[PDB]
């Protein structure tokens, strides 16, 4: 769904590639109404349309606005900031280092100076958790006029305020329409509307001075009237219009026994809303939650349709491969020689993999030797990464990422910098080579500064992406046409021109037929060394007991019964090489003793008990 977007989690760290940093933000927020993490707006230039932020109404985590030369940041409609994650772990709103003292970089008579001017938060009437940090904005006005105690929730511990008010600019008074002299800006529309301190007795939020005006106990930012259904924002969960404290549980008590879900009504907690099914990429627990990691003593299982859930390990919980950012690798940050052997023979990684210079270079104080390129083939068996994949560094003796040629999915439930499920920078590989990769579950893809990397536009990126607000961000790789110039283009057999690299082992869909992992013109349905059939565009072998049919088709399935015409002796179940003599059919069953005919048929033969017939043999 659009209207939900992921957080971000980069704090003050500089954009990985600045040339595409504004792009990531626009994709990531263009249609968004609820951020489900941190809204972080850092390093934005002076002339920078931020028109895409206009629809943001809730922020689940914190709001950071830091190191930007832009004058205004249009978050007018933003109403609540729940502060589930905090910046510096003690601030829901943090506003830092926006105007640059600038050093007369511009002419002495600059058209105007840079730096945020007013906060313009006409609708922020709720901060459920966390304080306010405001430092070193020289053009900033009105930060100190606001009454922040009104915004902080009744129950907001951490309601601290450190607000520098050093300004290079004198602030014109609040518009005269703002009796009280509290406002977010010069405009008459910027007056701080009050909803907590101006309340009648024993309430929490209110529309006005009296007890008629008091908001329902499940409201959070105010209300247009008294009922639940009348809130602006819900303290907990928006159950399709009504604000409630819990989502309806999924085990009702029918009057006669503990029956199953009121699920025509029972719902899953997903953020601050009740939903019927968890959205894509999230797991369902049995406790009515939508999650990104399962509960303890639990296992991720799947379903034929696609849905993933959590259920109890009724056995001992079978042991798993953790990636970085999980358990014993919770804070380690690189795949190195000290831990490479832990991923040996893993189909699926719970967590992430990052490869930094320190992986392949020494780091001798650690005493961890450099990672050998031979060691990377630990990952041949790997089909699924639940976290992200990040590669700052890669052996130059390797052309591609074939080591990960059986990677099918990257879930992106954990995201690098909070934003990216697949990042690749500074590598000088020549093509990607992830022939199996079929979906990036969450997040964007960032592929930049790979001098020799071709085979980027050849990838059908749009069919890896699931949720909107996913994109490929790319710059500073090798020029597309400098690639086809040198003879790097998809194999002619690659359907629609999509490949991960040179040759017929790298197509996305073969145009014609696929034998194994290579595209081919013809299966061996007629003229064939080994005879084979077709099945959903594949060449799969016939049974070794089907007989080659010179000119005509040789089989219709992989089994021996499926065969056209057997090459030796037949037993009705299927084509066989040797008629059975006294094999164990079951642990406690009679032995089947048969013999050939001249007709090739295995017929049973007459016996008593102790001596039998095996073509004249006891």
């Amino acid at each position, epitope marked *: 769904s659009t209207q939900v977007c992921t957080g971000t989690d980069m704090k003050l760290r500089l954009p990985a590639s600045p040339e595409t940093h504004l792009d990531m933000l626009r994709h990531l927020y263009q249609g968004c109404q609820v951020v489900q993490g941190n809204l972080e707006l850092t390093y934005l230039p002076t002339n920078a349309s931020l028109s895409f932020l206009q629809d943001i109404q809730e922020v689940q985590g914190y709001v950071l606005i830091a190191h930007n030369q832009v004058r205004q940041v249009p978050l007018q409609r933003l109403r609540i900031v729940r502060g589930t994650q905090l910046f510096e772990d003690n601030y829901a709103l943090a506003v830092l280092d926006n105007g640059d003292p600038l050093n007369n970089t511009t002419p002495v008579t600059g058209a105007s100076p840079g730096g945020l001017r007013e906060l313009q938060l006409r609708s922020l009437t709720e901060i459920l958790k966390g304080g306010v940090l405001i430092q070193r904005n020289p053009q900033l006005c009105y930060q100190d006029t606001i009454l922040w105690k009104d915004i902080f929730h009744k129950n907001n511990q951490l309601a601290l305020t450190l607000i520098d008010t050093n300004r290079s600019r*004198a602030c*014109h*008074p609040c518009s005269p329409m703002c009796k009280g*002299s509290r406002c977010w800006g010069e405009s008459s529309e910027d007056c701080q509307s009050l909803t907590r301190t101006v309340c009648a007795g024993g309430c929490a939020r209110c529309k006005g001075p009296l007890p008629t005006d008091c908001c329902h106990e499940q409201c959070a930012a105010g209300c247009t009237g008294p009922k639940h259904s009348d809130c602006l924002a819900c303290l907990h969960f928006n159950h399709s219009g009504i604000c409630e404290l819990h989502c309806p549980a999924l085990v009702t008590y029918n009057t006669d026994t503990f029956e199953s879900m009121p699920n025509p009504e029972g719902r899953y907690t997903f953020g601050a809303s009740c939903v019927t099914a968890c959205p894509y990429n999230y797991l369902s627990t049995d406790v009515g939650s939508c999650t990104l990691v399962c509960p303890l003593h639990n296992q991720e299982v799947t379903a034929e349709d696609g849905t993933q859930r959590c259920e109890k390990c009724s056995k001992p919980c079978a042991r798993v491969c953790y990636g970085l950012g999980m358990e014993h690798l919770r804070e380690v940050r690189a795949v190195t020689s000290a831990n490479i052997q832990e991923f040996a023979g893993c189909k699926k990684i719970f967590g992430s993999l990052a490869f930094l210079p320190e992986s392949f270079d020494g780091d001798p104080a650690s005493n961890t030797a450099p990672l050998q390129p031979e060691q990377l083939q630990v990952f041949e068996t790997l089909e699924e990464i639940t976290g992200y994949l990040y590669i700052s560094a890669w052996p130059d003796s390797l052309p591609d990422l074939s080591v990960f040629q059986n990677l099918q999915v990257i879930r992106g439930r954990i995201l690098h910098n909070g934003a990216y499920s697949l990042t690749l920078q500074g590598l000088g590989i020549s093509w990607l080579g992830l022939r199996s990769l079929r979906e990036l579950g969450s997040g964007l893809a960032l592929i930049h500064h790979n001098t020799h990397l071709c085979f980027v536009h050849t990838v059908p990126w749009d069919q890896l992406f699931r949720n909107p607000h996913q994109a490929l961000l790319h710059t500073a790789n090798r020029p597309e046409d400098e690639c086809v110039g040198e003879g790097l283009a998809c194999h002619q057999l690659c359907a629609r021109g999509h490949c991960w690299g040179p040759g017929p082992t790298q197509c996305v869909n073969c145009s014609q037929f696929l034998r194994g992992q290579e595209c081919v013109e013809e299966c061996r349905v007629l003229q064939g060394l080994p005879r084979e059939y077709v099945n959903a565009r594949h060449c799969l072998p016939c049974h070794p007991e089907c007989q080659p049919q010179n000119g005509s088709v040789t089989c219709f399935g992989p089994e021996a019964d499926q065969c056209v015409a057997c090459a030796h002796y037949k037993d009705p179940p299927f084509c066989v090489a040797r008629c059975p003599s006294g094999v164990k059919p079951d642990l406690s069953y009679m032995p089947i003793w048969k013999f050939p005919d001249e007709e090739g048929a295995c017929q049973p033969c007459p016996i008593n008990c102790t001596h039998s017939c095996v073509d004249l043999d006891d």
Partner: single-chain antibody
Amino acid sequence: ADIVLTQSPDSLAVSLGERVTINCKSSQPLEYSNNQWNYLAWYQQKPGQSPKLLISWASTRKSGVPDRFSGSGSGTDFTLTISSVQAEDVAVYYCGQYSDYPNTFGAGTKLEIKQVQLVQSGAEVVKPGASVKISCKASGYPFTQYFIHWVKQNPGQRLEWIGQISSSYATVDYNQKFKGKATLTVDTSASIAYMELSSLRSEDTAVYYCVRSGNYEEYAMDYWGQGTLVTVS
């Protein structure tokens, strides 16, 4: 174009208890787009001493100044009125706008019958063609939360705005008339503002006032220092 403020009565001689008006017209309207505020203050200079603010925002009266003094007007004409002039009220009263840079003042009007502290440096005698650096030490208020201006008052006693320095970032706006002439500085660590008059000539003979200013309702310049006379040989 610079905003010209022209006051109507050059001087009024008058009986105790009588009612007076003093009028001020400006060449453009002293308002800002976003607000209905009118960016005009009235100041009182009783001889011997520094000007003091009575009424900012035209309508609004500074706290402490008696009820006889009242501000009237909006748009382009403003009038001060004293219900009954007392013996304490013999002074020169200066019109003063702060809507557009440069800040301008009015000619003055002398009426006749019938805690913040900015401590300026001592007086100065200066050879024409040399330079001098006058100081100003602030006290009784959070220094970095306010601005500091410089205003010249010349022999004939009219007022010219020199400039403004932020007392935290040290950024300065100048009047173009004083670009070569004055340079504002601030040692924020000591609560001193400075000004440096350079290449002094005869027309720089004047008294140089240091004037505080703040934010929002306290936008207008409120507190003046005692003055430094700089006379050139």
